[PDB]
Design a protein around this ligand. Structure first.
Ligand SMILES: O[C@@H]1[C@@H](O)[C@H](O[C@@H]2CO[C@@H](O[C@@H]3CO[C@@H](O[C@@H]4CO[C@@H](O[C@@H]5CO[C@@H](O)[C@H](O)[C@H]5O)[C@H](O)[C@H]4O)[C@H](O)[C@H]3O)[C@H](O)[C@H]2O)OC[C@H]1O
Ligand SMILES: CC(=O)N[C@@H]1[C@@H](O)[C@H](O)[C@@H](CO)O[C@H]1O
Ligand SMILES: *[C@@H]1O[C@H](CO)[C@@H](O)[C@H](O)[C@H]1NC(C)=O
Ligand SMILES: *[C@@H]1O[C@H](CO)[C@@H](O)[C@H](O)[C@H]1NC(C)=O
Ligand SMILES: [Cl-]
Ligand SMILES: [Cl-]
Ligand SMILES: [Cl-]
Ligand SMILES: [Cl-]
Ligand SMILES: [Cl-]
Ligand SMILES: [Cl-]
Ligand SMILES: [Cl-]
Ligand SMILES: [Cl-]
Ligand SMILES: [Cl-]
Ligand SMILES: [Cu+2]
Length: 235
């Protein structure tokens, strides 16, 4: 159970974005139905009044929280991967439009899942803004908690993988458009019951065996990380 508070750009807090530049749902409940329109941008997908200005090569940091800002972030039991997708805003997230910019599942050296490191990072994870066409975009951050992913929601609606999905409105101003955005995948649609990484038993299968759900990260992506960039408590 987790939500996005706001974003930072180049290490500078953009301010509380809830219902402003984040298409925030009313609470931190997961989405579980892979076929639902809620998979796109969660349960209250509508245009919000602001879009955060960035330039290609900027560091965009999402900041998550549980109940209040800079708390325990997400329950420790919710082990699983983190991904970030991008789509043009004109799509409203519909169609074959979502391109993956970032994936982190399990780090063998550290023996930690992405969620574990998100907690340590005070909720913060980043992507570098790619050299796509200037314009308005949606950035879709997605945490998959796997604690009940041994079952499929479609079969047992009280269990299943849990998706914590947040869409930020981002305007890319300066970019050369040297890496124009390629074809993407649909949400809902890209994940099905048989997709690698949707049904998995974290308790009995080694975490090193885990494969996150495709698509693969786009070759034009410029990187990212799960790491604290700013101290919320100084404000
Ligand atoms: O040996 C292994 C077994 O142990 C393994 O069992 C699994 C263990 O984990 C089980 O899942 C737990 C389900 O309950 C979650 O706690 C809930 C989370 O939600 C809380 O409510 C929200 C809190 O946040 C507020 O903001 C929000 O308003 C609330 O709605 C609620 O209070 C908690 O009870 C635990 O985090 C999960 O760990 C799982 O079902 C078992 O299968 O099975 C495999 C076996 O090998
Ligand atoms: C693929 C990946 O990110 N692996 C990282 C590695 O680069 C890092 O140096 C190490 C630190 O423990 O943790 C992990
Ligand atoms: C899952 O979503 C689809 C598509 O909106 C819907 O038809 C179906 O009833 C949902 N399943 C549940 C259990 O609500
Ligand atoms: C691995 O753990 C060390 C200390 O435990 C930490 O400094 C480092 O950031 C971790 N790696 C990642 C990818 O966070
Ligand atoms: Cl603020
Ligand atoms: Cl759902
Ligand atoms: Cl604006
Ligand atoms: Cl708060
Ligand atoms: Cl919790
Ligand atoms: Cl950190
Ligand atoms: Cl739960
Ligand atoms: Cl550029
Ligand atoms: Cl980064
Ligand atoms: Cu939860």
């Amino acid at each position: 159970h987790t939500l996005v508070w706001g974003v930072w750009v180049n290490g500078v807090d953009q301010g509380d974005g809830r219902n402003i530049y984040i298409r925030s749902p009313p609470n931190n409940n997961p989405v579980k139905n892979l076929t639902s329109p809620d998979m796109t941008c969660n349960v209250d997908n509508r245009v919000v009044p602001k879009s955060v200005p960035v330039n290609a090569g900027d560091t965009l940091t999402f900041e998550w929280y549980h109940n209040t800002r800079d708390d325990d972030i997400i329950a420790s039991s919710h082990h699983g991967p983190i991904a970030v997708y991008i789509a043009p805003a004109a799509s409203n997230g519909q169609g074959n439009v979502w391109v993956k910019l970032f994936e982190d599942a399990y780090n063998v050296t550290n023996s930690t899942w992405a969620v574990d490191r998100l907690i340590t990072a005070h909720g913060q994870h980043s992507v570098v803004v790619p050299h796509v066409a200037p314009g308005d975009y949606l950035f879709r951050a997605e945490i998959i908690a796997l604690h009940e992913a041994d079952s499929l929601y479609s079969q047992n609606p009280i269990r299943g993988a849990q998706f914590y999905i947040s869409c930020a409105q981002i305007t890319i101003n300066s970019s050369d458009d040297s890496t124009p955005l390629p074809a993407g995948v649909p949400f809902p649609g890209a994940y099905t019951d048989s997709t690698p990484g949707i049904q998995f038993n974290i308790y009995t299968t080694p975490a090193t065996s885990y494969v996150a759900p495709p698509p693969s990260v786009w070759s034009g992506a410029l990187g990212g990380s799960i790491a604290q960039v700013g101290d919320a408590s100084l404000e």
